Design a protein around this ligand. Structure first.
Ligand SMILES: CCCCCCCCCCCCCCCCCC(=O)OC[C@H](COP(=O)([O-])OCC(O)COP(=O)([O-])OC[C@@H](COC(=O)CCCCCCCCCCCCCCCCC)OC(=O)CCCCCCCCCCCCCCCCC)OC(=O)CCCCCCCCCCCCCCCCC
Ligand SMILES: CCCCCCCCCCCCCCCCCC(=O)OC[C@H](COP(=O)([O-])OCC(O)COP(=O)([O-])OC[C@@H](COC(=O)CCCCCCCCCCCCCCCCC)OC(=O)CCCCCCCCCCCCCCCCC)OC(=O)CCCCCCCCCCCCCCCCC
Ligand SMILES: COC1=C(OC)C(=O)C(C/C=C(/C)CC/C=C(\C)CC/C=C(\C)CC/C=C(\C)CC/C=C(/C)CC/C=C(\C)CC/C=C(\C)CC/C=C(/C)CC/C=C(\C)CCC=C(C)C)=C(C)C1=O
Ligand SMILES: COC1=C(OC)C(=O)C(C/C=C(\C)CC/C=C(/C)CC/C=C(\C)CC/C=C(\C)CC/C=C(/C)CC/C=C(\C)CC/C=C(/C)CC/C=C(\C)CC/C=C(\C)CCC=C(C)C)=C(C)C1=O
Ligand SMILES: COC1=C(OC)C(=O)C(C/C=C(\C)CC/C=C(/C)CC/C=C(\C)CC/C=C(\C)CC/C=C(\C)CC/C=C(\C)CC/C=C(\C)CC/C=C(\C)CC/C=C(\C)CCC=C(C)C)=C(C)C1=O
Ligand SMILES: CCCCCCCCCCCCCCCCC[C@@H](O)O[C@H](CO[C@H](O)CCCCCCCCCCCCCCC)COP(=O)(O)OCC[N+](C)(C)C
Ligand SMILES: CCCCCCCC/C=C\CCCCCCCC(=O)OC[C@H](COP(=O)(O)OCCN)OC(=O)CCCCCCC/C=C\CCCCCCCC
Ligand code: HEC
Ligand code: HEM
Ligand code: HEM
Lengths: 62, 81, 73, 379, 241
């Protein structure tokens, strides 16, 4: 229960809605990058060795 | 009526409420919440299930009937002719 | 090649013969053969054992599915 | 200075219609399918609009253009499947919309209930003509059968079927003509949807109990905007699951083959949302009689308010009426299942029994049981 | 005649809710198409591109598309010359018109394969069992010499002759040319030809599932937060008495 952490977040970035919107924009930018990278890694893991990315090395520059 | 202020006549009614920020969003969701859902399910259980149970019986019976209708009959050329 | 049949063996044949020693896969075998013999004798019948074949094949292919691909690639 | 939303002309309508109209506090999730329908309508327009930017309504290039959209056009496949699957979701919401009214007695609002019937008929027309646009094997023959079934009209039928065709067969002129109707009709539906709300607004929405809720009305915005937003999220969940995992389960294959005029497929069937009617006409032995049955049916929905004879609006406190309602729902399920099966002795008799049972339930059984229930309570 | 024989549900590598196609199998399946299929089956809606990012490299695609001549437009005089072939070209038509196709196929018209998988019931399960199953006709049933008895064919009398057998072709990968192996590979290739968006579709689905799992609890919590004012309010009735 990081009550102090939530208190700091509110007092600095939520009391005014202008700051509230700005945090949202930066958060989504970072979130999409992390979400996309993690999801693609999971997809590649489940399908290891079948995607063309995993076999192109056997023909590219070859 | 059709607008707030002139809809109906009421007297001697008192209401109490609390701010959203001062109370939990999921209070007694297992002590009290789950029991209530179960109560609702049983209260309206035998008024619905029998009709759909019947539907399944006709569905299965009709499907199996059609299959038998397309199965070779021993009477077919039973006279060896 | 060293062999034109041994090298070209298809895992289908092995699984096929192997899974034809099961009560269901063999019981229907005679019910088919019996049907076959009936038409061979009867000279005017217009009957065939196609419906009898669709049960033997149904049973055989059901078992073949769960074992065939393990011996591929 | 008072709020501007109560003075600006455009803001008065928005405030009345969305922000502040009183609503019952106890309306359940069943009252959430009306807003979804419009949302689906909105979704069906935009997607279709983009598809219209690439589709070619001609007997020869129609099939080719669909293949081009699915493969070469960027994100064409997803747009097509959203359009196709959104149609089915629209009808599912539509049936649930109608079902709620029958159970909770909303039909008592005659003016609003009658407008609804028109919206349903228009919706079906839009969906039927849209299914011809792909110009597949099933589309060609589906239109052929559902159109040749106007030759039974006493004396004008034959004259009014060739006129619809634009010729002595179904060819490109039919395709282009249906394309224009498909485009235009949904916008008329949108306008009619505003008459539906308008006539509703002068009386107010109903509640599950069936008692007037003037004592406990609530402003629509905060509570129900978030509630309808939650419903929209769930609706999107269902739609995306259908499209992104199993797009073609609800469609019928053999529609992916070029339409062959001289090749009748062994098993012609309408779409899942139209099957219930197909079995009601295939059962009647007379061709004209089957058309009269398919029509007399849809219209019994208009007659429901007359046949109502109970002294309670809501069927919540009417246990016997509930049993009949679920029985009738099961009957519709049987009709749907029969619609998808070939003609044969068992299905035919089952369909015949279901049809008569469907009608007699609505006409005799429901009024009689309501009268008995009234007698029981000593009204 | 009788009810159609339903093919069984074979376990495919891509049948999983999140599984993807095996692209090496697609490459081998295409290699089969070039020799055995191309003779009398058409693929109208597939170009020599669409393979660059799937199995073959761009340079390999160029080398292969140039292997077959294609018709071009008019010349100075107006005559039509033949180009070596480019990426944007589609796969050559075995026959000009349906009449010639049927005339050379004993009346039967081989359908285009671009959507055969999503057209026939049972998917590739139907195709695989169709190619593997050519049984000797049962007793008491006869058919035209041109026709062939295949139980999975709805007429049980198919004009197409057995298309595949052991050692019809040698794959570059070096895998054995087993008839079962060939059938599986071509079925994978046909599945792709009918649903090229397969892999991307499932990737989007995975992202949607995780996003939905995150979102739905939050939106429900917000709704509970707003409605808590009513879900806990208490009433009283104090008449003047
Ligand atoms: C779907 C999965 C997410 C569901 C989110 C809502 C869940 C509500 C809930 O769990 O109540 C807490 C629940 C207690 O609920 P409660 O406070 O007593 O009464 C409030 C109602 O539950 C809930 O009352 P509510 O007012 O919050 O209603 C929420 C929801 C609840 O009902 C539904 O979930 C709709 C049915 C699913 C359709 C959408 C499927 C999407 C895939 O109903 C809707 O809003 C449906 C909107 C229309 C969506 C239609 C979209 C498709 C077209 O917590 C528990 O105790 C757990 C019991 C779980 C029992 C499950 C029984 C299953 C039979
Ligand atoms: C966008 C286009 C907006 C066009 C507005 C036309 C309606 C004007 C109006 O109702 O009163 C304004 C205005 C004076 O106010 P009012 O008559 O006392 O009624 C205002 C109340 O707030 C009216 O009381 P209410 O708020 O309870 O009535 C609501 C009704 C308002 O009336 C309508 O919208 C129904 C119009 C039916 C069109 C389809 C007819 C054919 C099918 O609309 C709805 O039912 C809800 C629609 C949901 C979407 C709201 C989007 C707002 C942005 O009436 C006019 O004379 C303007 C006429 C404009 C159309 C002329 C057509 C000539 C041909
Ligand atoms: C198995 O194959 C089959 C299918 O699958 C494949 C199918 O899909 C279908 C289904 C058919 C599908 C497409 C084809 C059918 C198409 C049609 C019937 C309709 C034909 C028309 C269309 C394209 C055009 C649609 C028309 C449009 C837009 C015109 C309407 C335009 C407007 C603005 C609307 C305006 C209306 C206004 C002002 C009137 C206002 C008032 C009202 C509603 C109030 C009601 C008034 C009244 C009298 C009624 C009240 C009555 C009272 C009390 C009496 C009670 C009534 C009783 C009856 C008892 C079939 C048949 C089938 O075979
Ligand atoms: C439960 O409680 C509730 C109620 O009860 C209290 C309610 O009552 C309601 C309200 C009921 C509902 C929604 C239900 C339905 C009811 C309604 C009133 C609404 C009815 C709906 C409609 C009419 C449909 C509305 C619209 C839809 C889909 C949009 C279609 C129309 C459009 C404009 C949309 C936009 C399309 C766009 C932009 C195209 C996309 C392309 C874009 C970038 C490229 C565009 C490019 C161009 C134009 C380029 C042009 C270039 C030109 C000239 C060249 C110029 C060149 C130069 C050099 C100058 C709810 C929700 C509720 O919950
Ligand atoms: C000067 O002072 C004034 C003012 O200020 C003081 C004012 O303010 C005003 C205020 C008023 C105005 C200016 C007036 C105008 C105001 C406006 C906003 C302008 C609005 C304009 C409009 C909406 C446009 C109106 C026209 C529209 C959309 C088009 C109308 C026509 C149609 C949709 C088509 C109708 C049908 C036609 C041609 C018939 C042909 C087709 C068919 C039969 C259909 C064929 C079949 C099918 C679809 C098939 C359906 C069935 C099918 C498949 C199967 C059925 C089942 C089987 C079994 C077969 C005025 C007058 C004034 O003076
Ligand atoms: C285009 C198609 C869109 C389709 C959308 C479909 C959506 C489906 C799902 C529906 C979800 C419904 C809920 C979504 C919002 C939930 C939270 C919301 O309801 O809360 C409100 C949301 O309100 C807003 O947050 C208010 C601030 C506005 C923020 C705007 C952010 C915009 C970001 C994107 C900008 C893009 C710019 C692009 C330029 C080119 C009020 O929050 P509240 O806690 O009571 O505000 C207190 C203010 N404080 C903090 C200052 C005290
Ligand atoms: C056309 C073919 C349609 C086929 C679909 C058949 C149906 C699928 C699902 C049917 C709904 C299933 C969810 C409801 C299950 C259920 O029984 O819940 C119990 C609960 C009972 O509670 P109440 O008595 O209201 O009291 C509440 C507080 N105590 O059920 C309800 O309330 C149901 C209210 C009606 C909602 C709609 C029900 C489904 C209707 C389907 C079709 C209706 C007729 C359509 C006619 C037009 C067709 C063109
Ligand atoms: C020229 C001989 C020939 C060969 C070899 C051939 N096709 Fe065909 N194909 C035909 C003909 C002819 C038909 C239609 C026969 C009929 O309908 O009786 C047909 C039909 C089909 C069908 C339709 C099955 C159905 O249920 O509609 C499929 C699928 C098919 N072929 C796939 C293939 C595949 C995979 C190969 C592997 C190269 C192949 N064909 C090779 C000529 C051939
Ligand atoms: C086809 C598009 C339709 C749309 C967009 C639509 C929209 C709506 C909306 C938003 C409501 C209020 C909110 C709600 O009830 O959920 C409503 C109520 C109603 N609708 Fe519809 N509707 C449509 C079709 C129909 C149909 C086909 C009927 C057939 C009976 C119908 C009958 C009713 C009735 C009787 C009400 C009153 C509900 C009440 O009083 O509680 N509507 N409609
Ligand atoms: C409620 C509104 C609508 C409904 C219910 C509806 C329904 C349908 C249906 C069921 C199909 C068949 C698609 C298929 O089987 O693949 C279709 C096709 C189509 N519709 Fe819509 N439609 C609506 C609105 C629109 C609009 C507004 C447009 C254009 C402005 C449009 C354009 C198209 C096009 C281009 C196709 C061809 C897509 C294809 O062949 O796959 N539709 N429609």
């Amino acid at each position: 229960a990081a009550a102090t952490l939530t208190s700091k977040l509110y007092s600095l970035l939520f009391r005014r809605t202008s700051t509230f919107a700005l945090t949202i924009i930066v958060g989504v930018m970072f979130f999409e990058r992390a979400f996309d990278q993690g999801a693609d890694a999971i997809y590649d893991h489940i399908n290891e060795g079948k995607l063309w990315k995993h076999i192109k090395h056997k023909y590219e520059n070859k | 009526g059709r607008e707030f202020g002139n809809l109906t006549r009421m007297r001697h009614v008192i209401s109490y409420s609390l701010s959203p920020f001062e109370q939990r969003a999921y209070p007694h969701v297992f002590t009290k919440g789950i029991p209530n859902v179960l109560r609702r399910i049983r209260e309206s259980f035998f008024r619905v299930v029998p009709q759909f149970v019947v539907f399944y019986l006709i569905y299965t019976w009709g499907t199996e009937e059609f299959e038998r209708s397309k199965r070779k009959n021993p009477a077919a050329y039973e006279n060896d002719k | 090649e060293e062999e034109e049949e041994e090298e070209l063996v298809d895992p289908l044949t092995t699984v096929r013969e192997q899974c034809e020693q099961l009560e269901k896969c063999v019981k229907a075998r005679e019910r088919l053969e019996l049907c076959d013999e009936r038409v061979s004798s009867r000279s005017h019948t217009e009957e065939d054992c196609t419906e009898e074949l669709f049960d033997f094949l149904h049973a055989r292919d059901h078992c073949v599915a769960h074992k065939l691909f393990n011996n591929l690639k | 200075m008072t709020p501007m939303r109560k003075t600006n002309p455009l803001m008065k309508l928005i405030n009345h219609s969305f922000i502040d109209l009183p609503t019952p506090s106890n309306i359940s999730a069943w009252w959430n399918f009306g807003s979804l329908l419009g949302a689906c309508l909105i979704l069906q327009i935009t997607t279709g609009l983009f598809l219209a930017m690439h589709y070619s309504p001609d007997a020869s290039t129609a099939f080719s253009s669909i293949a081009h959209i699915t493969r070469d056009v960027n994100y064409g496949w997803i747009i097509r499947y959203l359009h196709a699957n959104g149609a089915s979701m629209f009808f599912i919401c539509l049936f649930l919309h109608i079902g709620r009214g029958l159970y909770y007695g909303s039909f008592l609002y005659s003016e609003t209930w009658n407008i609804g019937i028109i919206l349903l008929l228009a919706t079906m027309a839009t969906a039927f003509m849209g299914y011809v646009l792909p110009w597949g094997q099933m589309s060609f023959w589906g239109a052929t059968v559902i159109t040749n079934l106007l030759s039974a009209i006493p004396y004008i039928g034959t004259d009014l079927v060739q006129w619809i065709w634009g010729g002595y067969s179904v060819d490109s002129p039919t395709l282009t003509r249906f394309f224009t109707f498909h485009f235009i009709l949904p916008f008329i539906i949108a306008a009619l949807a505003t008459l539906h709300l308008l006539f509703l607004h002068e009386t107010g929405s109903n509640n599950p109990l069936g008692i007037t809720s003037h004592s406990d009305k609530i402003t629509f915005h905060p509570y129900y905007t978030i509630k309808d937003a939650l419903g929209l999220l769930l609706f999107l969940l269902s739609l995306m699951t259908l499209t992104l995992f199993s797009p073609d389960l609800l469609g019928d294959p053999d529609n992916y083959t070029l339409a062959n005029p001289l090749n009748t497929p062994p098993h012609i069937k309408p779409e899942w949302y139209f099957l219930f009617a197909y079995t009601i006409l295939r059962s009647v032995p007379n061709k004209l009689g089957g058309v009269l049955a398919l029509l007399l049916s849809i219209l019994i929905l208009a007659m429901i308010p007359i046949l109502h004879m109970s002294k309670q609006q809501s069927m919540m406190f009417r246990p016997l009426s509930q049993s009949l309602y679920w029985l009738l729902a099961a009957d519709l399920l049987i009709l749907t299942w029969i619609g998808g099966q070939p003609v044969s002795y068992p299905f035919t008799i089952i369909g015949q029994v279901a049809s008569v049972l469907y009608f007699t339930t609505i006409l005799i059984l429901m009024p009689t049981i309501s009268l008995i229930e009234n007698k029981m309570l000593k009204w | 005649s009788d009810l159609e024989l339903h093919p069984p549900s074979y376990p495919w590598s891509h049948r999983g809710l999140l599984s993807s196609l095996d692209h090496t199998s697609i490459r081998r399946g295409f290699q089969v198409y070039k020799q055995v299929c191309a003779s009398c089956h058409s693929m109208d809606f597939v170009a020599y591109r669409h393979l660059v990012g799937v199995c073959y490299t761009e340079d390999e695609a160029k080398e292969l598309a140039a292997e077959v001549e294609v018709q071009d437009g008019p010349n100075e005089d107006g005559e039509m010359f033949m180009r070596p072939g480019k990426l944007f070209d589609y796969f050559p038509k075995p026959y000009p018109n349906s009449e010639a196709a049927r005339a050379a196929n004993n009346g039967a018209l081989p359908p285009d394969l671009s959507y055969i998988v999503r057209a026939r019931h049972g998917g590739e399960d139907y195709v695989f069992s169709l190619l593997t199953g050519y049984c000797e006709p049962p007793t008491g049933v006869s058919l035209r010499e041109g026709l062939y008895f295949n139980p999975y064919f709805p007429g049980q009398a198919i004009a197409m002759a057995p298309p595949i057998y052991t050692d019809v072709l040698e794959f570059d990968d070096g895998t054995p040319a087993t008839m079962s192996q060939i059938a599986k590979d071509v079925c994978t290739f046909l599945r792709w030809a009918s649903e090229p968006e397969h892999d991307h579709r499932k990737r989007m689905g995975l992202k949607m599932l995780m996003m939905m799992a995150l979102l739905v609890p939050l939106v429900y919590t917000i709704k509970r937060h707003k409605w808590s004012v009513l879900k806990s309010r208490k009433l009283a009735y104090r008449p003047p008495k």
